[PDB]
Design a protein around this nucleic acid. Sequence first.
RNA 1: UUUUUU
RNA 2: UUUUUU
RNA 3: UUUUUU
RNA 4: UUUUUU
Lengths: 388, 388
Amino acid sequence: MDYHKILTAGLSVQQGIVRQRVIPVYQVNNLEEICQLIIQAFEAGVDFQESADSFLLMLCLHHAYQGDYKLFLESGAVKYLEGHGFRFEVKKRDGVKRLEELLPAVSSGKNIKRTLAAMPEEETTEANAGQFLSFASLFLPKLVVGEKACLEKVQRQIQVHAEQGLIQYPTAWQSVGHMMVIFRLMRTNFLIKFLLIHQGMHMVAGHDANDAVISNSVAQARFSGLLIVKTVLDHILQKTERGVRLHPLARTAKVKNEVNSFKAALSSLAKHGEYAPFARLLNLSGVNNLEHGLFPQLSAIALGVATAHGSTLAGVNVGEQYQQLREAATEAEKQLQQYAESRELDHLGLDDQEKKILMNFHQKKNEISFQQTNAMVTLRKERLAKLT
Amino acid sequence: MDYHKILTAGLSVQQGIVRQRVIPVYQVNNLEEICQLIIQAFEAGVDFQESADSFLLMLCLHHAYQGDYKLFLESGAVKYLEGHGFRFEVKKRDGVKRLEELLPAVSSGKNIKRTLAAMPEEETTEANAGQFLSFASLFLPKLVVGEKACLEKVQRQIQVHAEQGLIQYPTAWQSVGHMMVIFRLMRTNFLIKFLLIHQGMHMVAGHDANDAVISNSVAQARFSGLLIVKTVLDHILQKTERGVRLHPLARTAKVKNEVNSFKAALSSLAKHGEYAPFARLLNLSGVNNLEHGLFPQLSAIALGVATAHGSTLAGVNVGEQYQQLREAATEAEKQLQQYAESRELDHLGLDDQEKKILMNFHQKKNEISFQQTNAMVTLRKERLAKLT
RNA sequence: UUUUUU
RNA sequence: UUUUUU
RNA sequence: UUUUUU
RNA sequence: UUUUUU
């Protein structure tokens, strides 16, 4: 019989229903006034402890379908979410004007009623659902990293979308605390980011400006936090027309054990399907099976072999446990790649002048790449110096 | 006939029902007020001698299903527990406000009534079931070791989850005695840790923040206390594509007898199934069959061969009965691994420059690993010096 | 009459 | 009785 | 716990 | 983010 079954026995389980969470959907006569009240409430700086979910669902409903309940509850995303415990019920309500009247009067929301009662119900702003969903969707790249990377990326991206004149934003939405509130709201919830991802990756044509911004952010926020998967699968586990061959820097025993464990975890992620490259954003099942430190030898070698080719990967930070191995790996890969290019140039049957000009071209290209990486390493050291 | 049947005759028994323990489930109109009273009661610092089980069950019921009795009593975990003597009955109760009124008035709980009667029923706190279950689930890694390792690990993990801004905890829950009370409650009971493990390993998607913390702690608390299983099955009992071969440091007679006894105990554990790597936490049947001292020769040799490869296993403590054998085993494995790597590099047909750079790379990697283990051993000696 | 160690 | 690192 | 560039 | 000429 087999004995090694116990190690990986619990990785692959069946599929059941464990949550059973029920979400209400309000069907109100007027909708745009309520959406303006919700946007004004989030601009006021308050939070909803549990009841934010129905509000964001109704806002996304107004943006997408413009008030079509029968087609919304027969969609594909709602059909997907009912296979994981979500249950959407529908409630009706007459002409209301206040979110306290719309609130289901839960005693835990006493502080919510206290904050919304102090909110002045007289001021009006100028926005809609599309601007709010685009400005929330800008946070999706680099969301796993932290606050500072998110703020730097979104302050770059607003200026990019302001130069190419698609959409302008109000200046009150560029204060720091408002961005902090939207960052916390995007980090805690689940439903809003799944709706943004599904709507961004399942449109075909007929895009608006807000849909263009959402689809651009979804396309840029791919494989965020899974750099180990790209750096292993591109170089270390190299695909040939015959089959799959290992890199010659990975032919020991311990690294081979790491490769086998990595193949098991990769199959555990590939269970999912179309939503697999977004996993760290959606925090799926087999996400915790792939971490740094659980693959100590393979990670640094894979990152060194990857940063030997590309010149932009020198800016990534690792830690004080892998750096010297990374340096040894990238130097060995540089010299092996130089020898391989020289032998491959000597392979084909050509003239001497063609070989001379190709050697000159390869030498100049290697010099340019060396200078760019030498600049990038000093820029990373300057970043870590300016951090403290 | 056979004569060796008597030694292992009692290891494998049949399956019957020996306990027959009955647990009540209270069905009350209001639930969140009672959950706040229970959390305030555990913050007060009192204990429940027998009646803690129904309280924790009702709290987990409020967190998971939000008050769905009919779907809870038809779940998978409750179906599993009825095969081992647990019997859940359901009782109803009108609008109550005090845990004395909810208590079934047992004369052994006279001290419980005395402590809860002295508890002031006026103060209110700010928490819920999810924060309490996550803060209780943080104790699951390193729970078998002792108090100090638990407190150090959870004070690390709270700061980790505070940097990556998912969840903040109240500062009153970080005093020492409160953590002691929750440690004692987690060590004595059984039902709460089984519910946490099942809910953590059977979700697929749709995680909340508290569910993310619980699933992370369940994933990190795997094979806790069964290091001998990993260190034997990874190296000593090495799997080949042909079959299973023994390590050349384990080809004597006594070690072969230890291997046969280990195979018998491994089959006794593999009887269980999906809950097998969690066994020392759940304290299952064949747990006591695998102990240190019952395998005197195999344990130290296996740990030495394991710590020859990895550089973090040098920090484990053993005792004054295995240390010199561990040292001899790890030195022999270092020199055998060096000779094997040199011969394997000399195996393949390549160029001289490639062999030169691969030898240089292997030499530098071995130097880095040697320096890291030399640091880790002195750190362990410093720990044992600072212990007394 | 049994005599360790876990 | 368990003793690392994630 | 993740750490680049688009 | 695209960057010419017709």
